[PDB]
């Protein structure tokens with residue numbers, strides 16, 4: 001189980017339901033690579049996200065391509081147009097991937113939001129890594145990413161495929177971080 | 183939604199978890215054919231059965247070839263070696279079935295028993311057909327097919343792919359029947 005998130009200096013990840021920061025072409029690009037790139041011969045990655053997050057993807061981008069899309073909602077009666085699956089909980093979503101037939105099609109599981117879901121998963125017993133983009137500048141948000149327990153998670157000063165120096169796009173700096181827990 | 187079964191004159195469907203009658207080659211062929219034949223190429227039929235039914239099939243025929251095998255168990259920790267899916271209830275399996283990614287891989291749904299599964303499936307609301315083979319002899323049995331609500335089901339005097347004549351194998355006579363509920 002991987003988690004991916006981009007967070008401003010103040011830990012906000014959302015605002016009015018949109019990104020608290022202007023679009024970062026390269027950043028979005030990195031999220032496309034990480035969640036798409038399957039380590040295995042002919043397997044696909046599964047992406048799990050709550051309702052608000054599905055809805056925050058430009059319609060013409062739905063469902064995220066090259067990946068299986070799963071929507072968590074204790075509420076929707078049927079899966080939003082374009083989504084692959086609906087689960088009511090995270091636990092039920094994780095279970096489903098343990099189904100023989102699914103197991104052999106899915107490679108990496110990525111949790112891409114939102115807040116309550118990051119919350120649930122970060123707590124989740126087990127081996128988990130967090131891919132965090134630190135957007136070094138203050139943005140006004142209404143939704144925040146949780147504190148990262150530094151008892152439990154460790155930063156990997158190096159990571160196959162992840163750049164190490166500070167990126168800048170539209171006078172906005174940010175670096176890619178990878179934390180692990182076992 | 184389809185149910186298929188073979189039944190004695192005394193409505194027996196099993197003994198010491200075996201078939202009450204000697205094996206009928208050609209009746210087996212028919213079960214095989216109907217459960218196997220999909221109207222759509224690139225789609226498979228899904229077979230649902232209770233645990234006792236799973237284990238009742240010769241380890242060599244498990245899972246039933248050319249079909250997705252779904253096991254129903256309240257108990258079971260994980261899915262038995264060879265199953266494709268495991269569900270807790272019929273309602274849960276049907277729900278699995280409406281998942282979009284699953285929806286486009288499966289054509290027809292066949293319920294293969296045991297008497298519990300049959301029963302639950304029988305009253306399930308909707309369009310339902312029952313494919314019943316009446317073996318024209320009494321056989322000692324411990325398991326029994328529920329009775330068909332004639333207030334609800336209607337025998338169709340005909341059906342494509344289903345031979346109308348009284349069949350015989352090894353001195354035993356049997357006939358194929360088709361019942362529908364709307």
Ligand SMILES: Nc1nc(=O)c2nc(CNc3ccc(C(=O)N[C@@H](CCC(=O)O)C(=O)O)cc3)cnc2[nH]1
Pocket residue numbers: 004005006025027028029030031032053056057058061064065112113133
């Ligand atoms: N690093 C990181 N960056 C993000 O932008 C991000 N966004 C979410 C949630 N929101 C979204 C919203 C839109 C799209 C999206 O349109 N994705 C497409 C376009 C990628 C591109 O244009 O480069 C995709 O194909 O991945 C993805 C995630 C979760 N984790 C993130 N994590």
Ligand SMILES: Nc1nc(=O)c2nc(CNc3ccc(C(=O)N[C@@H](CCC(=O)O)C(=O)O)cc3)cnc2[nH]1
Pocket residue numbers: 186187188207209210211212213214235238239240243246247294295314315
């Ligand atoms: N009409 C009907 N006849 C049955 O024998 C039957 N059996 C079950 C449950 N038990 C079983 C036990 C073994 C196999 C089985 O071995 N099937 C194989 C072989 C068929 C053949 O060899 O011709 C298969 O490929 O279906 C199937 C169902 C449920 N509905 C039935 N329904």
